[PDB]
Amino acid sequence: AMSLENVAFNVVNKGHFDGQQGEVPVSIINNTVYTKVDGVDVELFENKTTLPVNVAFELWAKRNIKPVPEVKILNNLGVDIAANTVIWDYKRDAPAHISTIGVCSMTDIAKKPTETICAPLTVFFDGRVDGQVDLFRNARNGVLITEGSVKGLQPSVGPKQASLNGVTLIGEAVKTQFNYYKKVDGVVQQLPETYFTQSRNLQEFKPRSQMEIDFLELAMDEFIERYKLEGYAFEHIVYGDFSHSQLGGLHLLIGLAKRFKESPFELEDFIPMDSTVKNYFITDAQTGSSKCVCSVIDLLLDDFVEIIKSQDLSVVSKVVKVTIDYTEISFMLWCKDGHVETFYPKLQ
Amino acid sequence: AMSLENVAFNVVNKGHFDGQQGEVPVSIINNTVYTKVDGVDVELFENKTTLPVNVAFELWAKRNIKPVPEVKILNNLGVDIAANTVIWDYKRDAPAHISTIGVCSMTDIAKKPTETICAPLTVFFDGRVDGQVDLFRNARNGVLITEGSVKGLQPSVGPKQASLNGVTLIGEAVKTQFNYYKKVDGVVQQLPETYFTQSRNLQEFKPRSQMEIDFLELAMDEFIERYKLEGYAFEHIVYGDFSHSQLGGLHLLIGLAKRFKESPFELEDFIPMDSTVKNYFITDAQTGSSKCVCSVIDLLLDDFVEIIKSQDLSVVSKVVKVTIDYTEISFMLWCKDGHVETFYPKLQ
Amino acid sequence: AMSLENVAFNVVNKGHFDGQQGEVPVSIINNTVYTKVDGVDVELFENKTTLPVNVAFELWAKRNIKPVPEVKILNNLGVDIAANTVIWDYKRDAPAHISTIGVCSMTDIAKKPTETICAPLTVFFDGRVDGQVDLFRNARNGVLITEGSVKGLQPSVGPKQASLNGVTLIGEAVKTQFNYYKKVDGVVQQLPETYFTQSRNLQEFKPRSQMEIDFLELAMDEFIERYKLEGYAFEHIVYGDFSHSQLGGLHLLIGLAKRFKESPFELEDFIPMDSTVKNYFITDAQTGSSKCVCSVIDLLLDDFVEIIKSQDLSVVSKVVKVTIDYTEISFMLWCKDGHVETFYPKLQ
Amino acid sequence: AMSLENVAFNVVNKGHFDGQQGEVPVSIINNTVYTKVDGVDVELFENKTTLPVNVAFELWAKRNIKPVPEVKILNNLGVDIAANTVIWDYKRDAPAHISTIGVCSMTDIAKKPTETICAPLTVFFDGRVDGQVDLFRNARNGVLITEGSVKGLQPSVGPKQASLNGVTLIGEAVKTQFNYYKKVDGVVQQLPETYFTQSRNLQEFKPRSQMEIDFLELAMDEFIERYKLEGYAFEHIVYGDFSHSQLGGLHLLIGLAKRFKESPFELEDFIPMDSTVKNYFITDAQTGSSKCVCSVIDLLLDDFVEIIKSQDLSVVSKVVKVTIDYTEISFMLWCKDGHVETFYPKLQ
Amino acid sequence: AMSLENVAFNVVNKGHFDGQQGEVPVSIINNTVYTKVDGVDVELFENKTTLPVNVAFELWAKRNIKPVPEVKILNNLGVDIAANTVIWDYKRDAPAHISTIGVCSMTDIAKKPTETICAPLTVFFDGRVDGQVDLFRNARNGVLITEGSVKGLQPSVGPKQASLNGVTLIGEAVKTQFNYYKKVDGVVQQLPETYFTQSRNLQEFKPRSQMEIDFLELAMDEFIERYKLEGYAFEHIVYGDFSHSQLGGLHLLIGLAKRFKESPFELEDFIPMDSTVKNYFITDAQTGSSKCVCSVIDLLLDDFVEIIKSQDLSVVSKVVKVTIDYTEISFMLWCKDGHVETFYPKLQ
Ligand SMILES: Cc1cc([C@@H]2CCCN2S(C)(=O)=O)no1
Ligand SMILES: Cc1cc([C@@H]2CCCN2S(C)(=O)=O)no1
Ligand SMILES: Cc1cc([C@@H]2CCCN2S(C)(=O)=O)no1
Ligand SMILES: Cc1cc([C@H]2CCCN2S(C)(=O)=O)no1
Ligand SMILES: Cc1cc([C@H]2CCCN2S(C)(=O)=O)no1
């Protein structure tokens, strides 16, 4: 009994699609959905997707409002479609997946993930929804998230944080750390050992360890001294070199956050999407130091120190592959006379 | 239980809105409504109105598919809104009236024509729908059409032709000639004695009398001779003067139709709408004679001959008011030495 | 002598429509109005309304730039149209009323509010404009605002605050508190006893009483102690319960403001419009506690304490009707053993 | 080396995409692709599809310009995608299939039809392109057209006509009759014995047999007499009954073509697409007889006579399934006292 | 005193911009200009240009309504801009020139053609407008048309036909044949001796000589016999070869018109604009013979016979340059044993 007016009634009365009965008058003008409220049109949704306005409106109304894995994790694990839900990508203002399974008549490829069309796709299953752990067991390809243990399956502990309505957070009143399971061609995969990105903001950055507290509170030379980081190019890589026309280093989000409290800078997100490594065209407002492609990763400073201190510093240029968010991130390690010169998440 | 998907289901399965239950997947992209048919989008409607695409789609689906009065008649009688139907204007590809009464939640000003909001508006009532002759009696303002007599109400016999799905025709299998009634401020108004325009096409023009048959067959000088029209400027007014840079006369549709079989011409409909008098920017392709505003009326040649022969030809310039389609059409009559020079439906 | 180029000249030279003579070159591309300034197009207005771009531009230029009643008050008092002005709704980026009286040729239903078309509509009259108090006296329906007394009419003192160019403020250099008068079918209404919402921001919240200062400065248990609020569920209703997956209470804007200084949260305004009670899909960023429809009202904490302390706490569930902004706001009062459990502005 | 400017260069210089090198300046404004020709923009394509303008432009440029099966045949045979070509649907002004294989980077699901993503889809293969008969053999699902025999494969002789650049024709300088083959889940399927629709126009209708020549020349009673069709309701079914408000019969295109030479009528194609059975909202302009859903099929009158004369006329109502264009078309046969009352392609 | 509402008033009341005073209510929605006529919006203009809707509307209203040179002639003579007029391109539904001189505030580069910005541009001057022959004399670059002689200036007699409101015609009531003059860098240029294209339609083709009358009446072998055209490949070039998959010849519009009366064909105008040589993707509906780029020229058959009979037939391949519409048109002449094989307006 699905309609535009019923999807709109649910948005107006329930804050999202809740399966409630009823209709409100709707008007569509270009890429915006309006509703008549006491004789005047009130905007309900502006389509920022490449889908038809009414189709994107329904998928946004039918989005998952429970803490879900962040889109970068789902992408890294090869998720193609979700089972009976919509993972809304808040960084793109669009659905995270092209098609749906049992959500919207326009985007649905199947009603149940058991349909043979879903067999070659990695379907995302949520153990919190009844019977989805059993659907993962029967699926050929898929990713499963659970809050507890699964019989016969060994889990991969995911990041502490999940996305709740576009807000990335480590839950206190809700569980956000999931057990991850994956299957390729009927075979349960052994998920690799992985670091996780911390998913922090530049403006609301909070340290998550004593090393991170010391990075933000101490001066450059005393932090490098305290943590025995001499010869590891933290001055360039983490702190950033703003002395030349091309901005040097600044590849760790904690370093950008430290810089941000002293002086502002413009970060141009030229590929706006969720990813383990982010690329920004950065312009430092104080110095005028800039970089077209400044790759930034948000690792816990302890995790970054462990990665850089676990490298052989005897090569001039070397690709260093690190598992972050279940994906292989290539870094470029440049050394000279046994000391680091630069270390950055490899661009292009 | 009104929805976009149900309006679309009715269009696809019934050819129009028929109150049938069911939904089809719909996608809206810009001003077009599409439906998924075997995996591909098929266009159902292109919005050419100034209303939101989905609202115009519903009003077009809910259009009256019975022979209805032509929009020019309804306009001439001062109709503002229709009671529980949509009069679709096929000349404008838009609803004939801004608001509705019991049709669409977005355009409705009321559910019943008895609501006090409808009292100041001239509501159109159809005696063919049950209870609408009584709704006219209750209405402060309105126009009523009927197929027979309404006890006590003095009728006006309307035009022989009506519009059935955009096709103007004099019915054979259907009744297209109605009795017309009107009320202004609770008082039944006496509709004037009127001529009716014939509503013919230039390309499919058919004569509707022996005078009209003779006009199209006989040469100019022998038709004027046979019908004693010497001194009535038919050579200028009806036939048209193509000898100078400004096209002379050509104000009767029959004259344009006669011209059309010999040589083509461009008629630019710069105000595209239904009206008793039409204005065209005409360019004769053979001679290059043209006129920016050439007013054209489609009167039966007998009715035009009766109007011109009933005039006093002793004045230089005089306004001649003639009742055509219930409205007062002003003509400009120019005479010299007791003979007509020109007679044309007056501009501005 | 109204034109798009003259409306644009006034915007460019006067900051708004001021009746000045002159024209500037204008270009319209989609929903944006541009002007040529030294060979380059400069954006003057982006249409966010459901009206044609040029019509919305003219109504926005012709908006009232004096402190006017907030749209929620006008809506609550049943205002349909304004007399010879445009009340711009800054929360919707659109005109507050569909039609105008003596403002714009496209939206005008009349030139003067004395026209019989305006008689059934509640016309808003401004006593500050010459002769508008007399127009209210002669109008069948209407709402009048004055700065002083009206002969023969008893006033209803409105809120201290008004909207000046979208900025809600209690005037110091301008008068913002008006005397309100209303007429229904020629009869001056006795406006009801009413509380007013304070119209404050979450980010710029300022206390307006010693109880409000104490709420923000004291801890939960000592404020509840000082003001004898034990058993009134302020911990749930005003302070908010962030311990479970569903956010508990948080229905008073002062409580959201207190929370906001400690930790941020996402308030999704899913029906963006001016209203006495606002609905938000709230997600607490610290805990992950969330609520799809969290109704929020901005009452002075003293006014809310007076409302809750004036209730009978012997019923399990009861609707409590309170007059706020001249409208009847239904609250849901839930009690147990003579104590409040919850009290919230009733949703749907 | 694919680009918008190269696709545009090919359209301008080759009449379509021909793999030629070069670029022309392009501008995209809304849904139209323009090119600069001597300082002025010349329209190259107007997007009437639900795809992005530049993507639809590339697929239209890359359309198959050889005689191809008509879209109704491809749909009836279950074709989902074409192998390394674009079948352009000229009835919809859009690609016949959503995705492509080796055509456009935006719509491509694969580069070669051998990719496992294509395995569940019925891929269309053209034996006229090198290596495509072998790609059919490797394909799990597919439809193959050939000009000659494929060793081992049992052929289906298809329709005489094919679509060459939107023009449906029976080839003289080109081969338009193909051998058809189909595979479902690796197994070559035996295509049924079928009738073919003739794909004729109402305005350019030409008879294709002596019975069809006699239908258009002879009067109703003498054609029915000559071909022994008494009691087969041809008067209703083929000729059409225009005496009542609902148009009776008129389900054969030849009957509509015969009617068309005497008097015009409106055929509203409310689902504009290629199909074996077409549905029209028909309004006869002469009588005013109309039908919301008038199903029309273009069978050779001999083929229709053979179908109706092969039926048992002893049942009141019966569904008659006939294979037309490889699909099963259900007809509704209504009889009384051993004679036909009506026979029509069944609706819904 | 220029405005959108005044331009709209002129269109409604004068059929075009006539400098009349007054305003009508206008609404702009997307690319369409509407006007309120008795409470409903009536479309006045649909923007098919790459200019802003209101700017294109003003230029279309301000178009030249006198017979003007066809856009192909103006392009061939290098015209960049017109002096104080708009040449409307009816083949493109857009202004023929990007900028204006004294027409529209948005498109104007100058008010008078004497401004130094116009000096490098070839300005079009009309001797029928007062003072424009003197403005040509002052102009550094320009093209001038006149009806009579200009003392001292050596004339070029132009084509007999001109475009009057989009209708190409040889005038009878108006003068359409002009004297042409041109200036490049202050120097009056001698216009070459030229042939003129006839500017005829395929559907309304009329012969303009006894050779053209004989081409359309006589069979191929007797026309070729009568006019001694043996060995000149008229069978291929003019008549067309429809026997192979690639359509042979068919480069003269008279040959396409002769073919058109026997059987229809699709002519795809892939570069829709006015030009001396037109390119079409042609598909013969009878045979299925087609050609992606079929260059077509409309020369008087006598003029084409004179061109082909004035060539040396002793070379295998040779470029033949012919002056048509003041421009140099290259033809490709292919011979064998002293006879023509093909002759076509050269592509790219
Ligand atoms: C029912 C019905 C009535 C008609 C009549 C008789 C024939 C002409 N018309 S009319 C007066 O134009 O509407 N046709 O069907
Ligand atoms: C090559 C080629 C083959 C054809 C044949 C022969 C003539 C009719 N056709 S057909 C069977 O309809 O496609 N034409 O060119
Ligand atoms: C004034 C005027 C002049 C013309 C002339 C005479 C008739 C043909 N033409 S022309 C040479 O083609 O333009 N018509 O009106
Ligand atoms: C159940 C449940 C768990 C949680 C939170 C609280 C702290 C730990 N986690 S977790 C692992 O990060 O998601 N809240 O409810
Ligand atoms: C006159 C006038 C009044 C005001 C302000 C100042 C303080 C009180 N008010 S009010 C009642 O809130 O609007 N300013 O000018």
From Swiss-Prot, chains A, B, C, D, E:
Q: Where is this protein found?
A: Host cytoplasm, Host perinuclear region
Q: How is the cofactor bound?
A: Likely affects Nsp15 binding to RNA.
**What region holds the Nsp15 N-terminal oligomerization domain?**
3-63
Q: Which reaction is recorded as catalysed by this protein?
A: uridylyl-uridylyl-ribonucleotide-RNA = a 3'-end uridylyl-2',3'-cyclophospho-uridine-RNA + a 5'-end dephospho-ribonucleoside-RNA
Catalytic positions? H236 (proton donor), H251 (proton acceptor), K291 (for uridylate-specific endoribonuclease nsp15 activity)
Residue ranges of every copy of the AV-Nsp11N/CoV-Nsp15M domain listed in the record? 64-189
Known outcome of mutating H236A? Complete loss of NSP15 endonuclease activity
Span of the secretion signal?
none
List cofactor names only.
Mn(2+)
Site residues by UniProt (Uracil recognition site): S295
Q: Where is the NendoU domain?
A: 206-345
Where, by residue number, does uracil bind?
Answer: K291, C292, V293, C294, S295, T342, F343, Y344, P345, K346
Site (described: Transition state stabilizer) = K291
Its function? Plays a role in viral transcription/replication and prevents the simultaneous activation of host cell dsRNA sensors, such as MDA5/IFIH1, OAS, and PKR. Acts by degrading the 5'-polyuridines generated during replication of the poly(A) region of viral genomic and subgenomic RNAs. Catalyzes a two-step reaction in which a 2'3'-cyclic phosphate (2'3'-cP) is first generated by 2'-O transesterification, which is then hydrolyzed to a 3'-phosphate (3'-P). If not degraded, poly(U) RNA would hybridize with poly(A) RNA tails and activate host dsRNA sensors.
Quaternary structure, from the entry: Homohexamer.
Q: What is this protein called?
A: Uridylate-specific endoribonuclease nsp15
Q: Which species is the source of this protein?
A: Severe acute respiratory syndrome coronavirus 2 (2019-nCoV)
Gene that specifies this protein: rep
